[PDB]
Please model this.
Amino acid sequence: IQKTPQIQVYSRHPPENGKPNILNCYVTQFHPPHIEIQMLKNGKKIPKVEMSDMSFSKDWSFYILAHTEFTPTETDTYACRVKHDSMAEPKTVYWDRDM
Amino acid sequence: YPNVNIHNF
Amino acid sequence: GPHSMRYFETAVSRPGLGEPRYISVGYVDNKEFVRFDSDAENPRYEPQAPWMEQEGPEYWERITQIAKGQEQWFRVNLRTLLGYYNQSAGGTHTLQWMYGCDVGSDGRLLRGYEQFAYDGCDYIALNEDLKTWTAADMAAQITRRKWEQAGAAEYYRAYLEGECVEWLHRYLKNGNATLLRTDSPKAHVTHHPRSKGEVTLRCWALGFYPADITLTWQLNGEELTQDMELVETRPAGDGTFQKWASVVVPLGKEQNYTCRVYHEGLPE
Model:
């Protein structure tokens, strides 16, 4: 059986747009441990992608902490994208200031 | 301290 | 007070690089203590908990050897499962393993863990009583009747009472100053651009030591909680967590609504 992940995008510190902050792509409960995570500024790749390591949990499910750097804005949309073999085509999720 | 596995599947 | 053993190990078949990736992570509380990865430039076990550095390097080899060597089984068991389950070799596969000594408050153990899973679901597992097994299906069930005769339960029983706990107690004492900590929720609420007129308002934890907290709202009279958002307690990722839980409110109907944060690490 193979799992379709659950993503969450988020301000590591509360955003105050326009001072820094960390962005986390938190990808959970999936199988198999092959995952693609593309974080995006506006519309593009980001380079700088720290992927904190794989642990799996008691239902054997995997998970990793993906994440970069950003000056939150009035302007820019940033998002995460997870290619994973369980999903037919990808998942792109948005950072929302309230969630 | 993990432990040697020592018998096949 | 009742206290972590586990080795969560996985070897995952690479199709086109070719040889399988193996990771071996030790958990003392909730806490790391060591990880090792076949993939890292030079594969060895590295101390995760900083107190772990206050470990001799005989421990390092004595142990990384058990890894170089452990690594070497996973491979052979991945292919051996390929047969029962009739699969090719141009595909991905994942054998996961979990074991530990179920700690105890004062010193003794209460529970033995020894479970295997092949390709996501449980394959073969050792029962509570440490002597007996439980297989999931016929192929997994072939590993069963064999292991059976030979004496796998015995060999593990040995180890789950033995080496295991001696060691647990080690990290446990060479641990402790660091395993105790903890972090007070740094809380608040936020009113949002919401609804109709129905403001969405949220209680944010945002980052507390250690995972466990639950937070509820009050009408004024009741804990709503028969009513919906919150969020999965997420990391941070400094080494704290965040949780948010929320409700809907009339427009300006402030009237009454409260919230209680519960994190013992905290006297609320």
